[PDB]
Design a binder for this molecule. Structure first.
Ligand SMILES: [Zn+2]
Ligand SMILES: [Zn+2]
Lengths: 64, 323
């Protein structure tokens, strides 16, 4: 279980931080419910995609 | 099996694989981008065809619209033309039959096929000398308001063209880009990318420059629309040039929804219906994006854990897109 991510849902050889890197220099919408004010990733409703993602997406409030 | 866009453009020594990727995207896009000669020929043949139309109707002109007037076209794809004399409406077909008969006779076409892009009748063919693919109609096929959105989106959105080309290529290698068989249409694809770009945490915060981050955004695009997007419940629209989600349940115009699981994007010329209704194969589309995500991410792991010697001359995109 990764030591870079600190998570225990994958090994180091598969840490999303490998490919999820950014080169740095209105309202929000949730992909789960068409609701505004929050990202679809950290939303309260039952998820609309029968497809899992125990590890987060780009679209969390963590602003990553 | 070859990846010509890689030649003389190896980035195997890059520290961040997500840069590797970004650079390869730009290589592909430039490789699929036209040359001066290519342009010269295209103009000649178009003019040659215009000249053949004048012969039937000296009042008519001919204009390129769509993928080819933006630069969102895949090489070898049909270039769309509208013919302009008052020849449309219900006289549309009768006039296409005449144009067809005439093209064949004058040798500017071999096999000519009549088809339809949303109740607009179209004539597809190949100009033999140049081998260029043409589709002619007496009416633009991409709405009017839609077309304008496209040009505007392309102005205020760095990265839009590049990601669209990649996604377009991907969808095409699988036959997932034709509405006739329930694939995604052109405007729809543009919409998805545009939306994604404009409401990405690092982008609305102006923290990131897409053109310097198209590797990650590519992956994250397939991640959003492949793994997380609430297709059942979420729709896409534009309130004031701003990409927007709204719940299906609020869109009353269509809420007796016979089929729940399907892409819903608000028609720019009619907020009353979605232009994505015809994409009935949306289930396999989602599977494919996820496939793309799986392939790209797996590949990234595979390289970031190999000897620089094993990376030499390798391609990240190569197996995801086909080409
Ligand atoms: Zn990890
Ligand atoms: Zn929500």
């Amino acid at each position: 279980q990764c030591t870079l991510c600190k998570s225990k849902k994958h090994s180091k050889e598969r840490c999303p931080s490998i490919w999820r890197a950014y080169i740095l220099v209105h309202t929000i919408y949730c992909y789960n419910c068409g609701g505004k004010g929050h990202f679809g990733d950290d939303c309260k409703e039952k998820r609309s995609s029968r497809v899992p993602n125990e590890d987060g997406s780009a679209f969390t409030g963590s602003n990553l | 099996g070859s990846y010509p866009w890689i030649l003389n453009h190896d980035h195997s020594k890059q520290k961040e694989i997500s840069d590797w990727l970004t650079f390869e995207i730009k290589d592909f896009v430039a490789y699929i981008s036209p040359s001066r000669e290519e342009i010269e020929i295209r103009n000649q043949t178009i003019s040659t065809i215009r000249e053949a139309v004048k012969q039937l109707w000296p009042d008519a002109d001919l204009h390129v619209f769509g993928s080819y007037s933006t630069d969102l076209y895949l090489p070898g794809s049909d270039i769309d033309c509208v013919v302009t004399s008052e020849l449309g409406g219900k006289e549309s077909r009768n006039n296409l039959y005449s144009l067809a008969s005439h093209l064949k006779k004058k040798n500017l076409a071999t096999e000519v096929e009549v088809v339809a892009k949303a109740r607009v009748p179209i004539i597809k063919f190949v100009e033999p000398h140049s081998g260029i693919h043409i589709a002619v109609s007496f009416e633009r096929t991409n709405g009017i308001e839609a077309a304008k959105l496209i040009r505007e989106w392309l102005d205020d959105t760095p990265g839009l063209r590049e990601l669209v080309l990649i996604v377009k290529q991907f969808l095409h290698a699988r036959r997932l880009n034709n509405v006739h068989t329930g694939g995604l249409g052109g405007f729809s694809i543009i919409c998805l990318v545009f939306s994604f770009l404009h409401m990405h945490p690092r982008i609305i915060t102006n923290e990131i420059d897409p053109k310097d981050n198209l590797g990650v955004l590519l992956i994250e695009f397939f991640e959003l629309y492949g793994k997380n997007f609430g297709y059942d419940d979420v729709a896409l629209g534009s309130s004031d040039g701003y990409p927007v989600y709204f719940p299906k349940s609020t869109w009353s115009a269509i809420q007796p929804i016979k089929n729940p699981f399907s892409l819903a994007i608000q028609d720019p010329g009619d907020e009353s219906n979605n232009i994505s209704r015809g994409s009935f194969n949306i289930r396999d589309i989602k599977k494919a994006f996820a496939g793309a995500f799986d392939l790209l991410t797996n590949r990234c792991f595979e390289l970031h854990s190999a000897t620089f010697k094993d990376r030499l001359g390798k391609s990240i995109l190569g197996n995801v897109i086909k080409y």
